[PDB]
Amino acid sequence: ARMYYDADANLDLLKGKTIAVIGYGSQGHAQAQNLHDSGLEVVVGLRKPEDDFTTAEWNQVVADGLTPLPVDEAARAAQIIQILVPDDIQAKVYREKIEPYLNEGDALGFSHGFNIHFGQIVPPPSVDVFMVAPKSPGHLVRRMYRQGVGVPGLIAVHNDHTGKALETGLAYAKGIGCTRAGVIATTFKEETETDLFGEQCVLCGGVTELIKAGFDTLVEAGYQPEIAYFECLHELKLIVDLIYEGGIGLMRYSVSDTAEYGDLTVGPRIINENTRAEMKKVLAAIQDGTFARELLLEFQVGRPVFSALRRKGQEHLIEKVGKELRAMMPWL
Amino acid sequence: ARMYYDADANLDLLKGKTIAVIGYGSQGHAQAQNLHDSGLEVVVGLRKPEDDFTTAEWNQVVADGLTPLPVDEAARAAQIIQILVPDDIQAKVYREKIEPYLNEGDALGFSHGFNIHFGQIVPPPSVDVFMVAPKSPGHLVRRMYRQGVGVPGLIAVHNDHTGKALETGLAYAKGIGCTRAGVIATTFKEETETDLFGEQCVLCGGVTELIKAGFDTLVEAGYQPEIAYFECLHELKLIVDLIYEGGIGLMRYSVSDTAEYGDLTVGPRIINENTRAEMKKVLAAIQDGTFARELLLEFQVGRPVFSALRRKGQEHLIEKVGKELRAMMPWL
Numbered sequence A, B: 001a002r003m004y005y006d007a008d009a010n011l012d013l014l015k016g017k018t019i020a021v022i023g024y025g026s027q028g029h030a031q032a033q034n035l036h037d038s039g040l041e042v043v044v045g046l047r048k049p050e051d052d053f054t055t056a057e058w059n060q061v062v063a064d065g066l067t068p069l070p071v072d073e074a075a076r077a078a079q080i081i082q083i084l085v086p087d088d089i090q091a092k093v094y095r096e097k098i099e100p101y102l103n104e105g106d107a108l109g110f111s112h113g114f115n116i117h118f119g120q121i122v123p124p125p126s127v128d129v130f131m132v133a134p135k136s137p138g139h140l141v142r143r144m145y146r147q148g149v150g151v152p153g154l155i156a157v158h159n160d161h162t163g164k165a166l167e168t169g170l171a172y173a174k175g176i177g178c179t180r181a182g183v184i185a186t187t188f189k190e191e192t193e194t195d196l197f198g199e200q201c202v203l204c205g206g207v208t209e210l211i212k213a214g215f216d217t218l219v220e221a222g223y224q225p226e227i228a229y230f231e232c233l234h235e236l237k238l239i240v241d242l243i244y245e246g247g248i249g250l251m252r253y254s255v256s257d258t259a260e261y262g263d264l265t266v267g268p269r270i271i272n273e274n275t276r277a278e279m280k281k282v283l284a285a286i287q288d289g290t291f292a293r294e295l296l297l298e299f300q301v302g303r304p305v306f307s308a309l310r311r312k313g314q315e316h317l318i319e320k321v322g323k324e325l326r327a328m329m330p331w332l
């Protein structure tokens, strides 16, 4: 893997330019504040204050010492526009408040490549397109920069038109602080497809249904739901913290030998070759555009499947018993 | 669930009694110190110092202000004996150092039910047998007790010879702080079987192989292993931390709508009715004694399956890439 560190990004390449950071959410408040104390001219594109949220966010941008402009005004101002609004809204915001104000040599930036990769945003060919995706949440992107240590990041450039697209996004990477720890060269295609696959098969879909299937197994066998909650959900955090810290090996070293033996022999019975074949199918739906199509069509008819499955999950017994037991532990 | 609190336990039922805590590891150190701070008469049963580890543990007891004794002397001093050495060691320790010193009316306590439930320790009928199983690791049992909050626990009674087994166990649970948070009534059978099931199917076996299968899917399809690490392992902690604090619903509220839709529709494809049927078979092996027999036989011939499978795990690419990447993240 190709790594880019400090001695690979020249922050002077941005002297005399403006960076529009559209949005001030998790990545927006973190990344815009990072580029300000890195010596770069930053404008923060938001909506005109109209209700309570758009005012409170506009006021907090001022409180941190940055300049807010309406999205069309920050986009007219800057030659480097980084879109950090929500993914499901990016197509409308770009089309209306960003697209008519693009010039040659301007560089368009993302932190997740779904919209570029699946053709929902198609910038003009005379425009640089880059991605800098940090591997840490917004509050950890901002808190770690103030501590002189970077968070690792992924770098991607989708269209090199000014001949310096890589160096230009590489400049943005140092501006937010990812080049300190090290930055991995990826593509929009790889970042988008792996992000969706991980979400679907492991981080969100896989683990929630593993948890629920375990809980259901115990409850259907007649064990107390309160006991099943502890053994299929609550105790998972301790285990995953260890994997996070020191890999699977640290976790297996820290649990009892009986648990490690059970892990080694039963894990592959639960997640077996049939499961691995299904993960391959799920990946193929991500690679061939049909998942993206399905999501996009779902949003166009008012999200009936998303609402129905969401509500079905909220009615699950594990959520009911969980609220009761979590009360008893206010220290979470 | 039948719940017990501080009001249901009478610490004065232990007046004039000496409690021996056998072991001083994760649960032993926390439970012994807690019992001491609650004004009870505690001795810690340890191997006489014979090497760096046993010298240090003995000195730790003294440093904490508690009284260490060799295990047989601790047993002879105490009327309540809490066995907190590793589960795979308890039968031999019990047979050699505890059993010959039991008197009618003594109480034998556990924090996990395996050895009583699967008949590896068979106490005389004249001895009360109870369990108080905290639902937190020892360092939290201790920390939460210091802060005047408890950790939740389970209470079970296996043999009531005196008629006071439950009251003794409840007094013990109050002494270590578990009735402060609340203690759930269960049985040795239920605690043992749900503990083994959760470890095998969800917490350790299920989640490690889910992680590995996701990682292998990505690597085999040609993506970069460093990227697969982030998307299949590294950011699972953020997800699980949210499930831990506020259930599946809080996590789904906190991820993007694309992830939640991917979660709701793909989760049950990965963990499906075949997976749930295999979980039922795994539970059946825990319920019919055959897993316990398999584990005990494995331990009797020097752990060759445990050692072979552990090593194969240690050679996996996810552990090699993970070590490289985690070194780039010093804050671990």
Ligand SMILES: NC(=O)C1=CN([C@@H]2O[C@H](COP(=O)(O)OP(=O)(O)OC[C@H]3O[C@@H](n4cnc5c(N)ncnc54)[C@H](O)[C@@H]3O)[C@@H](O)[C@H]2O)C=CC1
Residues within 6 Å of the ligand: A022, A023, A024, A025, A026, A027, A028, A046, A047, A057, A071, A083, A084, A085, A086, A087, A089, A093, A111, A112, A133, A134, A136, A137, A138, B256
């Ligand atoms: N949550 C995370 O930590 C990660 C997110 N990303 C990606 O960065 C992008 C932004 O992510 P988040 O910080 O979580 O976004 P967010 O959901 O926290 O907020 C987005 C910002 O855009 C504003 N906004 C909302 N609707 C708007 C509209 N119609 N017009 C103009 N502004 C609007 C919001 O006020 C908010 O300040 C996404 O594409 C995401 O996939 C990349 C790395 C990790």
Ligand SMILES: NC(=O)C1=CN([C@@H]2O[C@H](COP(=O)(O)OP(=O)(O)OC[C@H]3O[C@@H](n4cnc5c(N)ncnc54)[C@H](O)[C@@H]3O)[C@@H](O)[C@H]2O)C=CC1
Residues within 6 Å of the ligand: A256, B022, B023, B024, B025, B026, B027, B028, B045, B046, B047, B057, B071, B083, B084, B085, B086, B087, B089, B093, B111, B112, B133, B134, B135, B136, B137, B138
């Ligand atoms: N670790 C945890 O957080 C949980 C553990 N439990 C149960 O607590 C009990 C004790 O478990 P842990 O504290 O985790 O074990 P541990 O591995 O943390 O500590 C074991 C203790 O036993 C001592 N010991 C080891 N060999 C000995 C021997 N031959 N003779 C005398 N003493 C010896 C050790 O020096 C150490 O003091 C087990 O039944 C466990 O299943 C129950 C709740 C959660």
Ligand SMILES: [Mg+2]
Residues within 6 Å of the ligand: A195, A198, B231, B235
């Ligand atoms: Mg991700």
Ligand SMILES: [Mg+2]
Residues within 6 Å of the ligand: A231, A235, B195
């Ligand atoms: Mg447990």
Ligand SMILES: [Mg+2]
Residues within 6 Å of the ligand: A256, A258, A259, B195, B196, B199
């Ligand atoms: Mg266990």
Ligand SMILES: [Mg+2]
Residues within 6 Å of the ligand: A195, A196, A199, B256, B258, B259
């Ligand atoms: Mg995502």
